[PDB]
Design a protein around this nucleic acid. Structure first.
Ligand SMILES: [Mg+2]
Lengths: 112, 43, 120, 48
RNA sequence: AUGAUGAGGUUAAUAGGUUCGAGGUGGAAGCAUGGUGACAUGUGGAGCUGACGAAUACUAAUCGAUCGAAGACUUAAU
RNA sequence: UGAGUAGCGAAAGACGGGUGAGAAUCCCGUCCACCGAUUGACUAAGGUUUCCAGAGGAAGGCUCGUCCGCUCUGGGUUAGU
RNA sequence: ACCGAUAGUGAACAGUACCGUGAGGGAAAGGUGAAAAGCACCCCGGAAGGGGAGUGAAAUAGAACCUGAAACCGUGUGCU
RNA sequence: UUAAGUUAUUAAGGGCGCACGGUGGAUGCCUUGGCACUAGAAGCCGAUGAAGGACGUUACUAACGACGAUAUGCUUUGGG
């Protein structure tokens, strides 16, 4: 079977999340937890909490053995943007986008 | 650089302000014009 | 030698401060490039301390800033006294060494490589 | 000074071929604890 | 610039603390003697010394992991 | 799109201890540094609750934040001269 | 044989945000469900968010709530 | 075995087709609000203090409506 977890409206930009998320796609859970503890980007702890949540769902709701699980899917979608401004020289303003992300992890055991 | 608008409580109440607008005919025109528009602040 | 993102006098100042607090605490945590520089400043102090004479006690006072240590039994001594007293008698037979560096992970706020420099 | 034409999707994605990060060193702490970074020390959460 | 290149990773002289030199400066501190004193002389080419040359495992280059081949057909001589 | 690019607004910090899910950035200590006819101390204009205590960390703060001139709750200005 | 939320009043929720010393200028913003029955309890998490369970005809009707186009951003693949 | 020759295999990334998501708020359906008129009244108040406001008033009180220290209302005659 499969278990998933989502983190909605995380306040990091998606281009920055995907960069770490391309490291763990298609790996078994223990190795992915190891990789996320030693990478030093800003989104590593948030992704790690999402992965932990999925592993706990896989065990409490579907009675799966967490010793043999792989990260089947990992992706980040765009959330709604906060729009801000910064004053520039000579009375002008420039736009700033504070972007957000939806983060999804699903783990599986590979059987049916 | 010194800017325009150096605020002053007395100057503001004496140039604008209710009694000053009521002291002339063209000030009473302003007050009536702002009443007709429904404006919340008159002077 | 290496510039640590400082001018000539800021560098010399924080390098005496780094050498003095290592003698107080025996063990401090800092960045890696700073540890690799204070490594060779501390060991020359310990060399001066193993000689012991008055001419060298005065050369060590040019570094080694000025602090009071409060040990157990309410003993107050200066850093210059603790050096020449016990640090020198400890390594009285080493022939160099006296310090080791141990690496840790990157710091959170910036990417800096953190390090523990200790006094063997 | 300014771009003469806009940049298409395909050219933008070709330029980002090399823009990636790599997996770290990651040796395993044998005596006690989980993975650690190689040539590093983990006094807690690891015997090494 | 980064990457790349080259010297090394304990069966080790790679950094380089320690010891000894080259070169640089130019006579340390302390004490003694002379002088009313500023100072001078002796101990003593003294003391100090980043990057240069040697020697020495004392401190650090731990344990590990990953990648990586299996030699096709047709024809002619052999 | 340009692009993970330009910029992040004059300057000296270091280490120990603490608290916290999380600390270069908050609190405490020592040392160091900068101004000093002033970056010190008073009174006016002007602003109008920004003042104080306890709690908080979504947004604001050009980073972070356990902190705040920010959010919540409750307080605070006394004249015959 | 008038409009149906960029329309119709500037204004379906306002001469208010806001701008200007002043006279004056002047917005944006409607829709859960028949009924709040608006998610008891368990799990991961500091929280935010989520997975189950439950309500409901329906929860990819969960309050940023009818339908949910296009630009734009991703993940997986058949041929190249 | 050696020669001479022909033709295979890779996808760091890209292209096209398909499937599945997100962002966004078009389209359809709807109406609380408007627009143009017809018929019948009426039009203008005030020193007996106006039009328009400021402050207040509810057990808990920010805004709008209502009310005025008799204050989120008092009396009376009818209706219900
Ligand atoms: Mg795309």
């Amino acid at each position: 079977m499969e278990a998933k977890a989502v983190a909605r409206t995380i306040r990091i930009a998606p281009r920055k999340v995907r960069l770490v998320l391309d490291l763990i796609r298609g790996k078994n859970a223990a190795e992915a937890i190891a990789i996320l503890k030693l990478t030093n980007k800003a989104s590593s702890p948030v992704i790690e909490k999402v992965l932990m949540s999925a592993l706990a769902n896989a065990e409490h709701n579907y009675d799966m053995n967490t010793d043999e699980l792989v990260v089947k899917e990992a992706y980040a979608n765009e959330g709604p943007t906060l729009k801000r401004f910064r004053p520039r020289a000579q009375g002008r303003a420039s736009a700033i986008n504070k972007r957000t992300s939806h983060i999804t992890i699903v783990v599986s055991d590979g059987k049916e | 650089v010194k800017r325009t608008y150096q605020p002053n409580k007395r100057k503001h109440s004496k140039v604008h302000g209710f009694r000053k607008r009521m002291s002339t005919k063209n000030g009473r025109k302003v007050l009536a014009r702002r009443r007709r528009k429904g404006r919340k602040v008159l002077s | 030698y290496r510039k640590l993102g400082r001018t000539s006098d800021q560098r010399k100042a924080m390098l005496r401060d780094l050498a003095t607090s290592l003698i107080i605490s025996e063990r401090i945590e800092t960045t890696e490039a700073r540890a690799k520089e204070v490594r060779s400043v501390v060991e020359k102090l310990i060399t001066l301390g193993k000689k012991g004479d008055l001419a060298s006690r005065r050369n060590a006072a040019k570094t080694l800033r000025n602090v009071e240590i409060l040990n157990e039994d309410e003993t107050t001594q200066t850093a210059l006294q603790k050096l020449f007293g016990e640090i020198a008698e400890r390594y009285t037979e080493r022939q160099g060494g006296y310090t080791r560096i141990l690496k840790q992970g990157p710091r959170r706020g910036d990417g800096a490589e953190s390090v523990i420099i200790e006094l063997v | 000074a300014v771009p003469k034409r806009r940049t298409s999707k395909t050219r933008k994605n070709k330029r980002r071929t090399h823009f990636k990060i790599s997996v770290p060193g990651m040796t395993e702490c044998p005596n006690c604890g989980e993975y650690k970074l190689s040539h590093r020390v983990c006094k807690n959460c690891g015997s090494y």
